[PDB]
Amino acid sequence: ESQPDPTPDELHKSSEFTGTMGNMKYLYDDHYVSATKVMSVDKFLAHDLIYNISDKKLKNYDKVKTELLNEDLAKKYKDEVVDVYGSNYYVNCYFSSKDNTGGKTCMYGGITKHEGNHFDNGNLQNVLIRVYENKRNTISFEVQTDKKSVTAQELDIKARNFLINKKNLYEFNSSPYETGYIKFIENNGNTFWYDMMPAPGDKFDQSKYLMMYNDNKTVDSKSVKIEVHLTTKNG
Structure with a gap:
């Protein structure tokens, strides 16, 4: 408010x-990053959700980790089919699974449900x-x-x-x-x-x-x- x-x-x-x-x-x-009916594939820290979003243009990335304001906001969209739209950066980026590089793209929020x-x-x-x-x-x-x-x-x-x-x-x-x-x-x-x-x-x-x-x-x-x-x- x-x-x-x-x-x-x-x-x-x-x-x-x-x-x-x-x-x-x-x-x-x-x-920006744009995704149509994606559900979270996994997380790095408690507050973000990682999606399998491929650069649907000149392939710069295949996974996109977007961060929310906290764990609760993440918890809400994890398991959800969502549309995404936000501006990404390459400067810094998460160190996922330690098994499987090319392109990791980061962003904040930008998650709206498809339903x-x-x-x-x-x-x-x-x-x-x-x-x-x-x-x-x-x-x-x-x-x-x-x-x-x-x-x-x-x-x-x-x-x-x-x-x-x-x-x-x-x-x-x-x-x-x-x-x-x-x-x-x-x-x-x-x-x-x-x-x-x-x-x-x-x-x-x-x-x-x-x-x-x-x-x-x-x-x-x-x-x-x-x-x-x-x-x-x-x-």
Whole structure:
């Protein structure tokens, strides 16, 4: 339930990070893991579930270990047939069975059950996103999802992908924007947001950032609102 909005001296600034926005960019530009009717094959630590997800493209991996906020959240989805969608990283990765390498891909949350989570028909109310560049609302685009209770992560990954392409949200040196956050407003008024900018330093740690999503936070496509609030780098 309910999160305030970003306090001024609280948001991450790109002029403070110094290690290629390209490493932050790699996670959202045409990037994610997708699985349709998978059940957990096994676990590494109490809180994650390992799936036999093969890189259904240019095979980079065949197993994907996604971490949840704890053992209880894992316990809930283990034995379940789930749809998955999340952004993966290769930087760090689990040391399973010690018997059977090529590609181990990691992620956080991104697990939605297949059972009755799809629409009677197609991509429903393809989720609209409001963009504010320096207060001002300038764009609004929609993102499609075929599930009723979709992860906030999935929408976040599709929102950013769009922005990166037409707004150049993230680029290889740094970013056109100093600050940025994606605000999610649930139909009940519940509100929450994610900082879109990397922490101050040279390196960006992919896994530490992506941990935002381990909570496995879901919403509802039909009713949810989203506003991305940016702030351009001055000059």
